[PDB]
Design a protein around this nucleic acid. Structure first.
Ligand SMILES: [Mg+2]
Ligand SMILES: [Mg+2]
Ligand SMILES: [Mg+2]
Ligand SMILES: [Mg+2]
Ligand SMILES: [Mg+2]
Lengths: 164, 52, 209, 129, 143
RNA sequence: CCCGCCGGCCGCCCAGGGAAACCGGGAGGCUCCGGGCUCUGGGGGGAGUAUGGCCGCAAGGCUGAAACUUGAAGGCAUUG
RNA sequence: CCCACAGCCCCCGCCGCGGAGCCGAGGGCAAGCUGGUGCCAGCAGCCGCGGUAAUUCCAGCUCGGCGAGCGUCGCGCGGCGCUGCUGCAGUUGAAACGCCCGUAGUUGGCCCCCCGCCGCCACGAGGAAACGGGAGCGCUCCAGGCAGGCCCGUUGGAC
């Protein structure tokens, strides 16, 4: 057969079981306005990733502290979270993870990091600027609004040298 | 006895709204900033009367 | 005009002799005056919500006599919850009666941890069950961040009680709202009457209150 | 006919404690009953007890002090794997913090905490909290 | 207790469930085979047939109306069914001896609404969706 | 005569249980839901019918469907 | 630049087509104003609407949901503790054989300190990957792939 048959693929998001729920609609619209999200698939993606992290943390927490698997997996998970900036550096216990929330994921988006740096007037302005390729990360132009910046690259985000 | 006995006004020309993320901006402003007494509803007679 | 106490407990409340509601609850003293609680909540921290409004008819010689029945819950989102009902010929007066009854009866709610102890309790102390009519409810502690897994009606009660993480199960004819709310109320009420090994400590009775 | 002596003993104990009694008498004695009661005593639920010899069907006397809220048996002895204990704990116990689940192992009768400590499994006998 | 609970009793429990799960109407209707042999569509989403008579059916007692339907004969079975064209004034688009595509109603094989003994819907005629003809998206000038 | 024990037949009833009527020598000790064994049921009709099999002098008994149809049928209690 | 030849992606120069539909607005279930018709025409998964205001039909205005996708039909899982091992019911709602004996079958009080055997628990060997889980790596992100950096565990692909 064609080698293209062995290529993998998967979905990335989940839809709520009860759609018409007033508080949920209000909160989702509030978040969309605050962070200027395009559609409601982004929130579903964030919820999916958060659920994955929470499930991993639960499974690890069920075990004993001195379980080799627990140590290995918790160390990897904490390192990833710290490198990504989602979890604060000073927290190094698996319990703290279960308290995380999607807003922490959102705060690490490129729009957010360039807005808190005073490099853009607004999230909408940030998106428009990102599309036109006036921005760079570590000397490389990034035009994806949902691109997530690691902590080590936070000070390396600047305006594109070649942009007008 | 004739089917279709039950089956004329022209369409009013108005500027198209801003589609995409912009639609989310005005909806946010419609019911979180811009004013919508007697509590509030969505397009009851009284609210529509004032704008007319 | 001014709140004139009609009970010894009411007069004591009028004076500043007793300072906390937990003191009254510790001696299982019935409450008969709506002012005895609002004095301890001067800023109207207590919320309010009308769960259901239903109409009941009585057959008579000439037509039917209609009436309204209302259900109301109140809480400050800090280990306090109450439930009441009221019936009257008019909707507004029935709502007032239900609010008064809900305010009158109130119970503290015990909260605990799922595994790791981190400051403020976030879920129920342990498993709790309630029963009213055909309806049964189970409340199971949940981890932090799990939200409230429950139907819209029960979730409002759990919010007003000041809970954040909990798994629920319902059995019976749950479409009867009053019996569901009563079952959850009874389950919450039972919380401070369940003995645990932490409370095995033997303390001598005191001559206060 | 009589089959599960432990079930009858536990039902009698709970019945007596319900109406705030002080002593109970359970008719047939057995090694498993004795170990169950010893564990209960070490955890602080039932204080002291005595075994009365009569050559046949030895009787037992136990002294109560409240505290106990529920006790039971699982009749068919299921074989819990060492890593399958959390599900049973969640299903059976009110909370993951103070209940006890009894298992019989090649190392003897112990609690689920002790079996988790030694990372071994076995068969289930009962529970109390 | 009422149910057997011994450690060596798996066979009896399996047999009990095997026998007793045939008492559910849904399970029987699905796993028995009579419905499949009796359903004119043989477990298909929709079928293609020829209309042969255009008729009107009265409604039930609490309602009062004459619903417009046609008689169809399925190509792959040669049996007869009654299919109902709901949209207003859409009977005039259907002509006698015309090729049609007929699907089901919401419920699997029960009657829907006040229409007595009707279980099928017309969706396409002469290759054009009826919903599209009703909205004037297309025209049937080929017929 | 009265004070007990075993066994049996009954009445009222605190807890508890239940949709309730009521049970309480359990219909209790159960969503805080695991003593052992056996049988039966899964919306209402069609229908204990048709077709086969076994038994029986017969009358009939045991076993026992489907197509099709239908949105309620039922229980305990309240006011008229 | 790439490519067997050509596209495509990507990079460099000169001009520079900015386009949203599908469903719905009585309840379940988030979302209301005139004109027609008059139990007719039609809507309606269920409850129901329509016999002169039709908040439900047909139109206009307005509004809501998802969104480059939306809706309809059939099947499977879930919903369903309505197949119940966990975990249903059996006085009156559907349902304890008229009663006894009884074989297969299922279930069987207490007691021995250590030996043998069966089940049981734990560990281990042996035996394909792909899939799934999972360690590390900025295909610009991502769905993915096993890459890759210079001053690399013997660079890595562990389990
Ligand atoms: Mg049970
Ligand atoms: Mg039936
Ligand atoms: Mg049932
Ligand atoms: Mg009857
Ligand atoms: Mg019956």
């Amino acid at each position: 057969p064609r080698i293209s048959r062995h290529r993998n693929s998967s979905k990335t998001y989940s839809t709520p079981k009860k759609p018409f729920t007033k508080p949920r609609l209000d909160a989702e619209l509030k978040l969309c306005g605050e962070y200027g999200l395009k559609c409601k698939r982004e929130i579903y993606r964030a919820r999916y990733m958060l659920a994955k992290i929470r499930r991993t943390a639960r499974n690890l927490l069920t075990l004993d502290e001195n379980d080799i698997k627990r140590r290995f997996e918790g160390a990897a998970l904490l390192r990833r979270l710290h490198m990504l900036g989602i979890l604060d550096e000073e927290k190094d216990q698996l319990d703290y993870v279960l308290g995380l929330r999607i807003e922490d994921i959102f705060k690490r988006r490129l729009q957010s990091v360039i807005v808190e740096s005073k490099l853009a007037k607004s999230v909408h302005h940030a998106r428009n600027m990102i599309k036109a390729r006036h921005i760079s990360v570590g000397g490389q132009i990034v035009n994806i609004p949902s691109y997530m910046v690691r902590i080590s690259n936070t000070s390396r985000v600047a305006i594109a040298d070649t942009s007008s | 006895t004739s089917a279709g006995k039950v089956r004329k006004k022209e369409k009013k020309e108005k500027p198209r709204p801003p589609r995409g993320r912009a639609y989310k901006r005005l909806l946010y402003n419609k019911n979180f900033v811009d004013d919508t007494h007697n509590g509030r509803r969505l397009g009851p007679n009284n609210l529509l009367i004032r704008q007319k | 005009e001014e709140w004139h106490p009609s009970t010894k407990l009411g007069r004591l409340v009028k004076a500043g002799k007793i300072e906390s509601l937990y003191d009254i609850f510790k001696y299982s003293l019935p409450i008969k005056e709506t002012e005895i609680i609002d004095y301890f909540f001067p800023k109207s921290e207590l919320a309010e919500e009308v769960c259901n409004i239903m109409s009941v008819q009585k057959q008579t010689t000439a037509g039917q006599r209609t009436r309204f029945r209302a259900h109301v819950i109140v809480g400050n989102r800090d280990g306090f919850i109450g439930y009441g009902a009221g019936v009257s010929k008019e909707v507004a007066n029935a709502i007032k009666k239900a609010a008064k009854n809900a305010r009158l009866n109130i119970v503290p709610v015990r909260r605990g941890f799922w595994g790791g102890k981190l400051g403020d309790p976030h879920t129920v102390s342990s498993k709790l069950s309630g029963k009213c009519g055909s309806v049964r409810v189970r409340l199971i502690p949940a981890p932090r961040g799990a939200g409230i897994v429950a139907s819209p009606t029960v979730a409002k009660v759990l919010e007003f009680a000041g809970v954040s993480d909990v798994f629920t199960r319902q059995s019976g004819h749950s479409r009867t709202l009053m019996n569901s709310v009563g079952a959850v109320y009874n389950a919450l009420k039972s919380s401070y009457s369940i003995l645990t090994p932490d409370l095995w400590k033997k303390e001598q009775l005191d001559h206060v209150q | 006919v009589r089959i599960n002596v432990l079930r009858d003993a536990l039902k009698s104990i709970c019945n007596a404690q319900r109406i705030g009694k002080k002593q109970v008498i359970v008719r047939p004695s057995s090694k498993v009953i004795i170990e169950f009661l010893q564990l209960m005593q070490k955890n602080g639920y039932i204080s002291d007890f005595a075994v009365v010899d009569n050559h046949r069907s030895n009787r037992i006397v136990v002294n109560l002090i409240g505290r106990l809220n529920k006790a039971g048996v699982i009749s068919p002895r299921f074989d819990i794997p060492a890593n399958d204990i959390e599900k049973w704990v969640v299903n059976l116990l009110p909370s993951r913090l103070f209940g006890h689940i009894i298992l019989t192992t090649s190392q003897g009768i112990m609690d689920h905490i002790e079996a988790q400590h030694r990372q071994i499994g076995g068969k289930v006998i009962g529970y109390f909290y | 207790m009422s149910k057997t609970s011994g450690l060596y009793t798996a066979r009896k429990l399996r047999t009990v469930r095997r026998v007793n799960r045939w008492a559910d109407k849904k399970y029987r209707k699905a796993h028995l085979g009579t419905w499949l042999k009796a359903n004119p569509l043989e477990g298909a989403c929709m079928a293609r047939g020829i209309v042969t008579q255009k008729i009107g059916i009265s409604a039930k007692q609490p309602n009062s109306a004459v619903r417009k339907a046609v008689r169809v004969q399925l190509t792959k079975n040669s049996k007869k069914i009654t299919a109902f064209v709901p949209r207003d004034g859409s009977i005039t688009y259907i002509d006698n001896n015309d090729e049609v595509l007929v699907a089901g109603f919401g419920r699997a094989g029960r009657a829907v609404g006040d229409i007595p003994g009707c279980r099928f819907k017309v969706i396409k005629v002469a290759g054009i969706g009826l919903l599209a003809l009703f909205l004037r998206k297309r025209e049937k000038r080929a017929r």
